[PDB]
Amino acid sequence: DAWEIPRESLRLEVKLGQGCFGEVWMGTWNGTTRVAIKTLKPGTMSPEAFLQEAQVMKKLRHEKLVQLYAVVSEEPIYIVTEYMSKGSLLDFLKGETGKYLRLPQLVDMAAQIASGMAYVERMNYVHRDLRAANILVGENLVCKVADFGLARLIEDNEYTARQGAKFPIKWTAPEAALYGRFTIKSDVWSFGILLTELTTKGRVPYPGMVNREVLDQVERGYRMPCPPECPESLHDLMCQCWRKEPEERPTFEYLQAFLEDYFTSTEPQYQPGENL
């Protein structure tokens, strides 16, 4: 493992988050580099399962994808990545800064995410966990795709899908959640949901609905309505991402181009409102 580094080269400084599977720390590597350190609590999951996201990052590298720096393979397992100061997009959206974000900033962030996903698309991979909680934010509003624990090649003749899978229906394309059909198009569906998170300041999609109600409604044709102050053109994009037929959904290449040129090509008459 050419990515392996000695434990003593790391210094855990500030604890950013903690749960039942481990913790996330801000620290320093080699006494010169600020880094993010994800830890595994022994016994909560296999070290092999914990290190999966590290394996994916060794193959997937891009400006808009969080970069892997190093790994400490002996328990307690450590995953070292580039430090993203503002934390998760979800937390950022919900926090005190979120209130000042308007459509220009939110679309810019969506365009960066689309670029990272356009790379994932070109690499023939599928993320499977695309949502605001799994996007990291740095300075200058830089956004990068993170948490690659579920990412994998679409076609892998040596991969046997696990049955009885429990994927979050609110963010997962119905064909993927129901039939295990994960494609880049199912990631596009998730991107549409992410667009609602961006435009609602991080609210949970399908408010007031539980998982089973979401599945039934989505299969019946129900789609989330246009959020207040969100231009119809952006909601139209969300709906394209939510087409029942996976192949009728847009590419990330198209999404990136559309979002990058949004304020000149699609909504040139945009004017700031109260929230967007």
Side-chain angles (χ1 to χ4, degrees):
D1 198 349
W3 296 82
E4 196 75 18
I5 58 162
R7 309 194 68 106
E8 48 136 15
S9 69
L10 294 168
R11 185 176 63 189
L12 286 60
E13 303 179 345
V14 182
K15 216 286 281 300
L16 304 181
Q18 74 166 97
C20 57
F21 291 102
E23 306 183 317
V24 180
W25 287 77
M26 177 284 267
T28 304
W29 182 30
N30 292 144
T32 62
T33 313
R34 211 176 312 244
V35 304
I37 304 164
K38 186 175 181 177
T39 73
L40 186 253
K41 179 178 176 290
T44 60
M45 73 172 105
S46 69
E48 186 167 32
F50 179 73
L51 292 163
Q52 303 198 242
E53 65 180 84
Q55 296 307 319
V56 177
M57 289 190 272
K58 295 177 177 178
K59 304 144 189 61
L60 259 44
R61 284 155 293 121
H62 189 262
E63 154 193 55
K64 298 304 176 179
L65 305 201
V66 172
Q67 186 185 350
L68 172 66
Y69 284 167
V71 166
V72 174
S73 298
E74 180 164 37
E75 299 207 89
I77 314 299
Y78 277 7
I79 290 181
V80 188
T81 51
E82 75 179 278
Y83 180 56
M84 299 301 291
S85 59
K86 309 302 185 192
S88 76
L89 215 205
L90 181 66
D91 288 354
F92 184 57
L93 253 19
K94 295 163 61 71
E96 297 204 56
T97 312
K99 59 172 295 181
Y100 298 117
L101 293 169
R102 293 295 183 265
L103 205 68
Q105 291 78 42
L106 303 166
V107 169
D108 166 30
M109 289 191 279
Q112 291 180 64
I113 294 161
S115 177
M117 289 305 296
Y119 165 80
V120 173
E121 180 171 85
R122 297 192 297 272
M123 291 294 275
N124 302 310
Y125 265 68
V126 63
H127 191 281
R128 305 200 292 164
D129 211 347
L130 181 61
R131 54 199 286 177
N134 293 331
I135 293 300
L136 287 182
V137 187
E139 299 301 331
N140 309 292
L141 254 18
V142 176
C143 293
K144 301 186 184 194
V145 180
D147 204 329
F148 299 95
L150 287 173
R152 61 165 173 87
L153 285 155
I154 298 174
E155 264 295 298
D156 196 314
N157 95 296
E158 292 198 87
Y159 164 79
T160 302
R162 293 176 293 255
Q163 298 306 289
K166 12 81 266 298
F167 287 90
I169 226 295
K170 294 183 189 179
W171 280 266
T172 311
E175 75 278 1
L178 276 179
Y179 311 122
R181 292 209 280 219
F182 289 92
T183 63
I184 189 63
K185 295 303 185 185
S186 52
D187 275 345
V188 174
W189 179 290
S190 299
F191 186 77
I193 300 298
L194 170 53
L195 288 180
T196 73
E197 296 184 277
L198 280 163
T199 54
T200 65
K201 198 189 183 309
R203 295 309 301 278
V204 173
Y206 307 98
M209 293 184 198
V210 291
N211 292 156
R212 195 161 175 199
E213 168 70 340
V214 172
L215 178 54
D216 189 65
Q217 285 292 293
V218 167
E219 281 296 337
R220 206 177 186 197
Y222 177 82
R223 297 300 185 265
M224 283 188 277
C226 183
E229 293 186 328
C230 177
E232 211 61 69
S233 61
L234 235 191
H235 178 255
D236 286 343
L237 190 71
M238 297 176 187
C239 290
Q240 290 174 72
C241 292
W242 305 325
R243 292 299 171 201
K244 191 188 192 303
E245 308 76 12
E247 295 302 324
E248 289 310 284
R249 273 117 74 163
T251 66
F252 276 114
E253 175 183 273
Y254 171 92
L255 290 168
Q256 182 189 345
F258 180 96
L259 298 163
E260 282 175 353
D261 298 3
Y262 193 74
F263 294 91
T264 304
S265 297
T266 312
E267 290 299 323
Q269 303 176 147
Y270 162 84
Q271 290 290 132
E274 268 293 299
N275 296 277
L276 260 32

mmCIF file of all heavy atoms in Angstrom, residues 76-108:
data_model
loop_
_atom_site.group_PDB
_atom_site.id
_atom_site.type_symbol
_atom_site.label_atom_id
_atom_site.label_comp_id
_atom_site.label_asym_id
_atom_site.label_seq_id
_atom_site.Cartn_x
_atom_site.Cartn_y
_atom_site.Cartn_z
ATOM 1 N N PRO A 76 -6.460 1.579 15.391
ATOM 2 C CA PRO A 76 -7.622 2.274 14.821
ATOM 3 C C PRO A 76 -7.324 2.799 13.414
ATOM 4 O O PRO A 76 -6.387 3.575 13.222
ATOM 5 C CB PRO A 76 -7.843 3.437 15.797
ATOM 6 C CG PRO A 76 -7.130 3.012 17.059
ATOM 7 C CD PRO A 76 -5.905 2.351 16.515
ATOM 8 N N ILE A 77 -8.135 2.387 12.443
ATOM 9 C CA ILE A 77 -7.944 2.790 11.049
ATOM 10 C C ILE A 77 -8.154 4.284 10.816
ATOM 11 O O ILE A 77 -9.120 4.870 11.308
ATOM 12 C CB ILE A 77 -8.893 2.025 10.090
ATOM 13 C CG1 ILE A 77 -8.909 0.532 10.414
ATOM 14 C CG2 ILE A 77 -8.444 2.216 8.644
ATOM 15 C CD1 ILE A 77 -7.577 -0.130 10.264
ATOM 16 N N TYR A 78 -7.258 4.876 10.029
ATOM 17 C CA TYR A 78 -7.304 6.298 9.693
ATOM 18 C C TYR A 78 -7.330 6.577 8.178
ATOM 19 O O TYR A 78 -6.552 5.993 7.426
ATOM 20 C CB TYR A 78 -6.064 6.995 10.268
ATOM 21 C CG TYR A 78 -6.171 7.402 11.726
ATOM 22 C CD1 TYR A 78 -7.256 7.022 12.516
ATOM 23 C CD2 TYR A 78 -5.153 8.180 12.287
ATOM 24 C CE1 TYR A 78 -7.292 7.434 13.848
ATOM 25 C CE2 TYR A 78 -5.173 8.598 13.610
ATOM 26 C CZ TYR A 78 -6.255 8.213 14.363
ATOM 27 O OH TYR A 78 -6.255 8.668 15.723
ATOM 28 N N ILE A 79 -8.240 7.462 7.730
ATOM 29 C CA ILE A 79 -8.334 7.814 6.309
ATOM 30 C C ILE A 79 -8.044 9.312 6.249
ATOM 31 O O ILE A 79 -8.756 10.112 6.852
ATOM 32 C CB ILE A 79 -9.724 7.510 5.689
ATOM 33 C CG1 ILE A 79 -9.936 6.000 5.569
ATOM 34 C CG2 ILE A 79 -9.824 8.137 4.295
ATOM 35 C CD1 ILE A 79 -11.282 5.601 4.951
ATOM 36 N N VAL A 80 -6.970 9.678 5.554
ATOM 37 C CA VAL A 80 -6.546 11.074 5.451
ATOM 38 C C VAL A 80 -6.864 11.674 4.090
ATOM 39 O O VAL A 80 -6.400 11.186 3.064
ATOM 40 C CB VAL A 80 -5.024 11.207 5.732
ATOM 41 C CG1 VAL A 80 -4.622 12.666 5.809
ATOM 42 C CG2 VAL A 80 -4.670 10.487 7.028
ATOM 43 N N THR A 81 -7.639 12.753 4.098
ATOM 44 C CA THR A 81 -8.043 13.428 2.866
ATOM 45 C C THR A 81 -7.814 14.934 2.957
ATOM 46 O O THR A 81 -7.447 15.452 4.015
ATOM 47 C CB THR A 81 -9.540 13.200 2.585
ATOM 48 O OG1 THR A 81 -10.294 13.523 3.762
ATOM 49 C CG2 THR A 81 -9.808 11.755 2.191
ATOM 50 N N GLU A 82 -8.075 15.640 1.855
ATOM 51 C CA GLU A 82 -7.907 17.088 1.835
ATOM 52 C C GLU A 82 -8.947 17.740 2.735
ATOM 53 O O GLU A 82 -10.106 17.326 2.770
ATOM 54 C CB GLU A 82 -7.995 17.646 0.407
ATOM 55 C CG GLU A 82 -9.384 17.719 -0.176
ATOM 56 C CD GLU A 82 -9.397 18.307 -1.576
ATOM 57 O OE1 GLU A 82 -9.368 19.551 -1.714
ATOM 58 O OE2 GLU A 82 -9.447 17.520 -2.543
ATOM 59 N N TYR A 83 -8.512 18.741 3.486
ATOM 60 C CA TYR A 83 -9.379 19.454 4.412
ATOM 61 C C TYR A 83 -10.353 20.393 3.697
ATOM 62 O O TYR A 83 -9.957 21.164 2.829
ATOM 63 C CB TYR A 83 -8.515 20.232 5.412
ATOM 64 C CG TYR A 83 -9.287 21.025 6.444
ATOM 65 C CD1 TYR A 83 -10.227 20.408 7.271
ATOM 66 C CD2 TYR A 83 -9.064 22.391 6.605
ATOM 67 C CE1 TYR A 83 -10.922 21.134 8.237
ATOM 68 C CE2 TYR A 83 -9.755 23.126 7.569
ATOM 69 C CZ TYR A 83 -10.680 22.490 8.380
ATOM 70 O OH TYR A 83 -11.363 23.212 9.334
ATOM 71 N N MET A 84 -11.635 20.271 4.030
ATOM 72 C CA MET A 84 -12.687 21.109 3.459
ATOM 73 C C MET A 84 -13.293 21.884 4.628
ATOM 74 O O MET A 84 -14.144 21.376 5.355
ATOM 75 C CB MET A 84 -13.745 20.250 2.763
ATOM 76 C CG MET A 84 -13.213 19.406 1.608
ATOM 77 S SD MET A 84 -12.448 20.371 0.283
ATOM 78 C CE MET A 84 -13.888 21.206 -0.420
ATOM 79 N N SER A 85 -12.832 23.120 4.787
ATOM 80 C CA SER A 85 -13.217 24.021 5.880
ATOM 81 C C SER A 85 -14.674 24.227 6.284
ATOM 82 O O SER A 85 -14.962 24.344 7.476
ATOM 83 C CB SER A 85 -12.575 25.393 5.661
ATOM 84 O OG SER A 85 -12.984 25.941 4.418
ATOM 85 N N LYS A 86 -15.588 24.301 5.322
ATOM 86 C CA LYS A 86 -16.996 24.533 5.656
ATOM 87 C C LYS A 86 -17.814 23.282 5.977
ATOM 88 O O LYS A 86 -19.000 23.380 6.315
ATOM 89 C CB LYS A 86 -17.686 25.334 4.549
ATOM 90 C CG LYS A 86 -16.954 26.604 4.138
ATOM 91 C CD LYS A 86 -16.741 27.559 5.301
ATOM 92 C CE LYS A 86 -16.120 28.867 4.817
ATOM 93 N NZ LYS A 86 -15.629 29.730 5.940
ATOM 94 N N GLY A 87 -17.186 22.113 5.884
ATOM 95 C CA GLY A 87 -17.888 20.873 6.172
ATOM 96 C C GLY A 87 -18.824 20.426 5.057
ATOM 97 O O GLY A 87 -18.621 20.759 3.888
ATOM 98 N N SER A 88 -19.866 19.682 5.420
ATOM 99 C CA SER A 88 -20.806 19.184 4.425
ATOM 100 C C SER A 88 -21.682 20.299 3.870
ATOM 101 O O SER A 88 -21.976 21.275 4.555
ATOM 102 C CB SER A 88 -21.682 18.066 5.007
ATOM 103 O OG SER A 88 -22.680 18.584 5.865
ATOM 104 N N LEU A 89 -22.090 20.137 2.617
ATOM 105 C CA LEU A 89 -22.942 21.106 1.936
ATOM 106 C C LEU A 89 -24.237 21.262 2.727
ATOM 107 O O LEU A 89 -24.757 22.370 2.872
ATOM 108 C CB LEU A 89 -23.288 20.602 0.535
ATOM 109 C CG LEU A 89 -23.445 21.579 -0.632
ATOM 110 C CD1 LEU A 89 -24.348 20.948 -1.682
ATOM 111 C CD2 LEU A 89 -24.000 22.917 -0.196
ATOM 112 N N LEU A 90 -24.750 20.139 3.229
ATOM 113 C CA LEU A 90 -25.986 20.132 4.001
ATOM 114 C C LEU A 90 -25.861 21.030 5.234
ATOM 115 O O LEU A 90 -26.714 21.881 5.474
ATOM 116 C CB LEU A 90 -26.343 18.703 4.428
ATOM 117 C CG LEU A 90 -27.637 18.535 5.229
ATOM 118 C CD1 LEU A 90 -28.836 18.892 4.363
ATOM 119 C CD2 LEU A 90 -27.751 17.105 5.731
ATOM 120 N N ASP A 91 -24.794 20.830 6.007
ATOM 121 C CA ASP A 91 -24.550 21.623 7.211
ATOM 122 C C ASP A 91 -24.373 23.094 6.857
ATOM 123 O O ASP A 91 -24.877 23.978 7.551
ATOM 124 C CB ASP A 91 -23.304 21.114 7.942
ATOM 125 C CG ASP A 91 -23.520 19.769 8.629
ATOM 126 O OD1 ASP A 91 -24.661 19.256 8.655
ATOM 127 O OD2 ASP A 91 -22.534 19.225 9.166
ATOM 128 N N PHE A 92 -23.657 23.348 5.765
ATOM 129 C CA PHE A 92 -23.403 24.705 5.296
ATOM 130 C C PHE A 92 -24.727 25.392 4.938
ATOM 131 O O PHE A 92 -24.988 26.528 5.348
ATOM 132 C CB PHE A 92 -22.484 24.644 4.078
ATOM 133 C CG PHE A 92 -22.069 25.983 3.555
ATOM 134 C CD1 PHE A 92 -21.430 26.901 4.380
ATOM 135 C CD2 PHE A 92 -22.297 26.319 2.228
ATOM 136 C CE1 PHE A 92 -21.023 28.137 3.893
ATOM 137 C CE2 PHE A 92 -21.893 27.556 1.727
ATOM 138 C CZ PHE A 92 -21.255 28.465 2.564
ATOM 139 N N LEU A 93 -25.561 24.686 4.178
ATOM 140 C CA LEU A 93 -26.864 25.192 3.752
ATOM 141 C C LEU A 93 -27.753 25.524 4.950
ATOM 142 O O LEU A 93 -28.458 26.538 4.944
ATOM 143 C CB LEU A 93 -27.568 24.142 2.886
ATOM 144 C CG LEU A 93 -27.726 24.271 1.365
ATOM 145 C CD1 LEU A 93 -26.754 25.252 0.757
ATOM 146 C CD2 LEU A 93 -27.593 22.889 0.744
ATOM 147 N N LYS A 94 -27.731 24.658 5.963
ATOM 148 C CA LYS A 94 -28.552 24.841 7.165
ATOM 149 C C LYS A 94 -27.991 25.862 8.162
ATOM 150 O O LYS A 94 -28.749 26.476 8.920
ATOM 151 C CB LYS A 94 -28.760 23.495 7.874
ATOM 152 C CG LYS A 94 -29.568 22.469 7.071
ATOM 153 C CD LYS A 94 -29.395 21.048 7.631
ATOM 154 C CE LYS A 94 -29.880 20.926 9.084
ATOM 155 N NZ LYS A 94 -31.364 20.997 9.188
ATOM 156 N N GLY A 95 -26.671 26.033 8.158
ATOM 157 C CA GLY A 95 -26.017 26.959 9.071
ATOM 158 C C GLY A 95 -26.278 28.440 8.842
ATOM 159 O O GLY A 95 -26.982 28.826 7.911
ATOM 160 N N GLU A 96 -25.673 29.272 9.685
ATOM 161 C CA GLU A 96 -25.838 30.722 9.606
ATOM 162 C C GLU A 96 -25.436 31.375 8.280
ATOM 163 O O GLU A 96 -25.948 32.435 7.937
ATOM 164 C CB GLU A 96 -25.122 31.407 10.773
ATOM 165 C CG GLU A 96 -25.682 31.028 12.147
ATOM 166 C CD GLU A 96 -25.409 32.087 13.202
ATOM 167 O OE1 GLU A 96 -25.808 33.251 12.984
ATOM 168 O OE2 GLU A 96 -24.798 31.758 14.247
ATOM 169 N N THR A 97 -24.546 30.742 7.523
ATOM 170 C CA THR A 97 -24.129 31.309 6.238
ATOM 171 C C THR A 97 -25.182 31.052 5.164
ATOM 172 O O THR A 97 -25.382 31.870 4.251
ATOM 173 C CB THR A 97 -22.799 30.715 5.764
ATOM 174 O OG1 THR A 97 -21.856 30.752 6.837
ATOM 175 C CG2 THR A 97 -22.252 31.514 4.598
ATOM 176 N N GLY A 98 -25.869 29.924 5.302
ATOM 177 C CA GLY A 98 -26.889 29.545 4.347
ATOM 178 C C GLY A 98 -27.931 30.607 4.069
ATOM 179 O O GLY A 98 -28.363 30.758 2.927
ATOM 180 N N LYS A 99 -28.305 31.368 5.096
ATOM 181 C CA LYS A 99 -29.314 32.409 4.943
ATOM 182 C C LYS A 99 -28.952 33.490 3.937
ATOM 183 O O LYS A 99 -29.841 34.118 3.368
ATOM 184 C CB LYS A 99 -29.662 33.049 6.296
ATOM 185 C CG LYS A 99 -28.487 33.686 7.023
ATOM 186 C CD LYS A 99 -28.938 34.463 8.264
ATOM 187 C CE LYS A 99 -29.809 35.655 7.871
ATOM 188 N NZ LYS A 99 -30.247 36.463 9.042
ATOM 189 N N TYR A 100 -27.656 33.701 3.713
ATOM 190 C CA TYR A 100 -27.195 34.723 2.773
ATOM 191 C C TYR A 100 -26.994 34.216 1.348
ATOM 192 O O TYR A 100 -26.917 35.001 0.404
ATOM 193 C CB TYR A 100 -25.921 35.394 3.295
ATOM 194 C CG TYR A 100 -26.138 36.121 4.606
ATOM 195 C CD1 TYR A 100 -25.473 35.724 5.764
ATOM 196 C CD2 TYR A 100 -27.043 37.179 4.696
ATOM 197 C CE1 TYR A 100 -25.705 36.364 6.989
ATOM 198 C CE2 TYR A 100 -27.284 37.824 5.915
ATOM 199 C CZ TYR A 100 -26.612 37.408 7.054
ATOM 200 O OH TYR A 100 -26.858 38.029 8.261
ATOM 201 N N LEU A 101 -26.927 32.901 1.190
ATOM 202 C CA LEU A 101 -26.754 32.311 -0.132
ATOM 203 C C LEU A 101 -27.979 32.581 -1.006
ATOM 204 O O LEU A 101 -29.113 32.458 -0.547
ATOM 205 C CB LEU A 101 -26.549 30.799 -0.007
ATOM 206 C CG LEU A 101 -25.271 30.277 0.647
ATOM 207 C CD1 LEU A 101 -25.406 28.783 0.899
ATOM 208 C CD2 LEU A 101 -24.070 30.556 -0.243
ATOM 209 N N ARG A 102 -27.745 33.007 -2.242
ATOM 210 C CA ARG A 102 -28.831 33.264 -3.189
ATOM 211 C C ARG A 102 -28.630 32.365 -4.410
ATOM 212 O O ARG A 102 -27.644 31.629 -4.475
ATOM 213 C CB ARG A 102 -28.866 34.741 -3.593
ATOM 214 C CG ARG A 102 -29.246 35.680 -2.448
ATOM 215 C CD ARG A 102 -30.673 35.440 -1.965
ATOM 216 N NE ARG A 102 -31.055 36.379 -0.910
ATOM 217 C CZ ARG A 102 -30.973 36.129 0.395
ATOM 218 N NH1 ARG A 102 -30.526 34.958 0.828
ATOM 219 N NH2 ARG A 102 -31.315 37.068 1.273
ATOM 220 N N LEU A 103 -29.532 32.450 -5.386
ATOM 221 C CA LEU A 103 -29.441 31.598 -6.575
ATOM 222 C C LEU A 103 -28.084 31.575 -7.298
ATOM 223 O O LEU A 103 -27.638 30.515 -7.725
ATOM 224 C CB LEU A 103 -30.574 31.903 -7.566
ATOM 225 C CG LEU A 103 -30.944 30.739 -8.493
ATOM 226 C CD1 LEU A 103 -31.600 29.611 -7.685
ATOM 227 C CD2 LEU A 103 -31.895 31.227 -9.592
ATOM 228 N N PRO A 104 -27.419 32.736 -7.464
ATOM 229 C CA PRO A 104 -26.122 32.701 -8.153
ATOM 230 C C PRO A 104 -25.104 31.802 -7.460
ATOM 231 O O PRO A 104 -24.417 31.023 -8.119
ATOM 232 C CB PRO A 104 -25.685 34.164 -8.136
ATOM 233 C CG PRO A 104 -26.999 34.885 -8.260
ATOM 234 C CD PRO A 104 -27.844 34.129 -7.241
ATOM 235 N N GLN A 105 -25.032 31.892 -6.133
ATOM 236 C CA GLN A 105 -24.096 31.074 -5.368
ATOM 237 C C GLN A 105 -24.500 29.608 -5.386
ATOM 238 O O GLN A 105 -23.658 28.739 -5.562
ATOM 239 C CB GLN A 105 -23.995 31.544 -3.913
ATOM 240 C CG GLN A 105 -23.319 32.883 -3.716
ATOM 241 C CD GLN A 105 -24.219 34.048 -4.044
ATOM 242 O OE1 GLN A 105 -25.398 34.055 -3.690
ATOM 243 N NE2 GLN A 105 -23.662 35.058 -4.706
ATOM 244 N N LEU A 106 -25.797 29.342 -5.252
ATOM 245 C CA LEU A 106 -26.298 27.973 -5.238
ATOM 246 C C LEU A 106 -26.129 27.263 -6.584
ATOM 247 O O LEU A 106 -25.808 26.084 -6.621
ATOM 248 C CB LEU A 106 -27.761 27.953 -4.790
ATOM 249 C CG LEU A 106 -28.017 28.586 -3.411
ATOM 250 C CD1 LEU A 106 -29.502 28.836 -3.220
ATOM 251 C CD2 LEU A 106 -27.482 27.697 -2.311
ATOM 252 N N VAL A 107 -26.329 27.986 -7.682
ATOM 253 C CA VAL A 107 -26.184 27.407 -9.020
ATOM 254 C C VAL A 107 -24.713 27.116 -9.313
ATOM 255 O O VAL A 107 -24.383 26.098 -9.934
ATOM 256 C CB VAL A 107 -26.800 28.327 -10.104
ATOM 257 C CG1 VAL A 107 -26.415 27.858 -11.504
ATOM 258 C CG2 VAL A 107 -28.308 28.322 -9.973
ATOM 259 N N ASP A 108 -23.844 28.012 -8.852
ATOM 260 C CA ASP A 108 -22.396 27.881 -9.006
ATOM 261 C C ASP A 108 -21.948 26.592 -8.305
ATOM 262 O O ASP A 108 -21.149 25.818 -8.844
ATOM 263 C CB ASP A 108 -21.711 29.113 -8.390
ATOM 264 C CG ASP A 108 -20.205 28.939 -8.197
ATOM 265 O OD1 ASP A 108 -19.554 28.207 -8.964
ATOM 266 O OD2 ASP A 108 -19.663 29.575 -7.270
#
